[PDB]
Amino acid sequence: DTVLTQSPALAVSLGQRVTISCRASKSVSTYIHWYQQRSGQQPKLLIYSASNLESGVPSRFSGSGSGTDFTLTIDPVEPDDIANYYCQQINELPYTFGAGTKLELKRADAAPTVSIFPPSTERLATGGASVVCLMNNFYPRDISVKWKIDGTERRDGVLDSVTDQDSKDSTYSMSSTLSLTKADYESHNLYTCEVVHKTSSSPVVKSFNRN
Amino acid sequence: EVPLFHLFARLDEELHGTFPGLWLALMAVHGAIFLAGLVLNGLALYVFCCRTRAKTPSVIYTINLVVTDLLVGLSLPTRFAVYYGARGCLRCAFPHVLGYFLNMHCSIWFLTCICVDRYLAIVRPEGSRRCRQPACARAVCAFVWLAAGAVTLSVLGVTGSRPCCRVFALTVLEFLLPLLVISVFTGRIMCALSRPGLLHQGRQRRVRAMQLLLTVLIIFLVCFTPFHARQVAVALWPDMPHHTSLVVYHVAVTLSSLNSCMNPIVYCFVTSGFQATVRGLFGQHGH
Amino acid sequence: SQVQLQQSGAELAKPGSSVKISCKASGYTFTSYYISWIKQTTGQGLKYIGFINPGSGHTNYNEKFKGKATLTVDKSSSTAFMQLSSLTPDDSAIYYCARGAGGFLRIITKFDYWGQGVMVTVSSAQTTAPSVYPLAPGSSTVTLGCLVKGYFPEPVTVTWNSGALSSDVHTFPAVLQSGLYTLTSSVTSSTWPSQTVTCNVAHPASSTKVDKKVGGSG
């Protein structure tokens, strides 16, 4: 069974050449299909047999390579090419797809807009507690968020959600929620979410004591 | 419930999927076999129709044999042509299946008939009261063709809707019986030859019959044993792995098709003009 | 017409049950081309399940999906069917049907067209109305949002001020916990608290429309 490992997701800019590398495990002569999975759409076959364009796709795409390593070249790029890309071998019967690469736009490394949001008043009435930290409009993707609790490390039941690429400004957004029982919430006083990002060496602090 | 007619095309597609290199190698072997069988059987048909005059019953059986061989050779690339130009259509996969059945039945029984006629012309000259008489040979050939049609209709069905295998009653009346007949005839020939008291031309005729019977026995044991062995093992041993069954089935089909190329050794024993026109063709090719 | 492979709608099933998803081909001779079924999960990548020849009826399955997926063909209406048996929450994924052209060197050498995809969600939970939770802190542009907790199934829409506010509207992806979904949205309004904002939510399957004012201190 062949294992196909694709290149890690990389940032692209408008008009510059980009390439996607797909490396197989065993030898596949020329049997790599290159698709394009857009946001909420079926995959569209761009390249078949690792070199031939599909009838209908623009000529900006070009597949190349044979044997073990394969490449897909896009030049130039427009916002219609910001999507997933999968390499699939059809040599042996257990057809194996790649992990997929996320192309996305590059721009200025904006700082996150981090925000404590207090649990609501009637959250305690229903028998629960959910505290949230929200940050948005930041670059890059690798953002670290963690819950500072009275000078102690704390992870349990912390759920994190990350949005996709923004359409109008090409940024990211993130929410982190901690689900705690109302008794353990009211037993404790100090609350913080510590957020560390590439935008600044100094970590951003945003705490919560009572208001 | 998935009759054998479906199963032939399914096995073809399954081998093409799982083992592409073996499938292409079998394609190359089938193409070479078709070429060799076509040229050899065309030469044999021309020799036995437009050259020889003494229409002995052996000549009639051999003419039917070359007709069967030509039909199987023509059906050999028909399988791949149907598989590629008309894939999915399994109704049109009938001609190569019928070629398989013809190769299994008519070649086996016409070789048996040639051996029987050769035996009856050596030990027991009956005065041509029941044997000889080329109308009798024509009737025997017609009955063999009707038996082949009946066997195909009994295995596949009226409309190709017979499930399961039902193979135990076929390999005994189709492979074990001619093998037993040829074995007992060559045993009788060997027993007669071992006993002293035979004059030299009678001994020569007996040993020539020995070569003919042993050649037909070798053809039987090489080109048809794997098919019936696989058919027996697929019923006695259903535990057997599926990949092994597929590969063994395709190799057996390849050898059963190789029977068409390996048959013309018998034509050297049937008549003396075959090698004469072979030498003539070789001389024409050289000059 | 051009080649098309239509598919059914999204299917919500129960664990241990079975489901059947249909791919209807149109615009070409149905028996001349293979139909392949392929998986895609959100966490992992695409995974190939199997294929079937509509004409000869020959099927092939992946080793992982053997005994789980079953492929059938109805040639009269020209439709392929895939049946999932013994469904588990692992199988919540999007399934595609692909029209695979026959080839010479290999059995399939092309994968022209794909279906629009059928989302199969396996969960023992039933449909439940959401419980929105407005929350506000207590610069001029201050973040505001509500917490939508405990709803089923997945699709739900959140609207800000009935569409009046559309500046920095961030609907985060929803996560699953204890068999139920939770949602959070955010917006920045420099007019707070002079201008009240509403948390308009609408669950289509639950047919529930809730508007909530954030309120809060200040």
Numbering used by the authors:
A (entry chain C): 288 to 498
B (entry chain R): 31 to 317
C (entry chain B): 19 to 156, 162 to 241
What text appears in the publication on this structure?
GPR20 is a class-A orphan G protein-coupled receptor (GPCR) and a potential therapeutic target for gastrointestinal stromal tumors (GIST) owing to its differentially high expression.
To understand the conformational changes induced by G protein coupling, we aimed to determine the structure of Fab046-bound GPR20 without Gi heterotrimer. We then determined the GPR20-Fab046 complex structure at a nominal global resolution of 3.08 Å. This structure is of sufficiently high resolution to allow assignment of the majority of Fab046 residues consisting of the intact light chain and VH + CH1 region of the heavy chain. Structural comparison of GPR20-Fab046 and GPR20-Gi-Fab046 reveals an outward movement of TM6 for about 7.6 Å (based on Cα of G2326.26) and an inward movement of TM5 for about 4.5 Å (based on Cα of L2235.65) at the intracellular side in the Gi-coupled relative to Gi-free GPR20 structures. Moreover, through structural comparison of GPR20-Fab046 with active and inactive β2AR structures, we found that the GPR20-Fab046 complex was captured in an inactive-like state resembling the conformation of the inactive β2AR structure. Another possible reason for this difference on TMs 5–7 is that the presence of the N-terminal cap region may stabilize GPR20 in the intermediate state, so that GPR20 could be quickly transformed into the fully active state in the presence of the G protein. An extra cryo-EM density in the core of the 7TM region was observed in the GPR20-Fab046 map. As it was previously reported that GPR20 might be closely related to lipid receptors, we tried modeling the endogenous ligands from all known structures of lipid GPCRs into this unassigned density one by one, however, none of them could be fit into the density properly (data not shown).
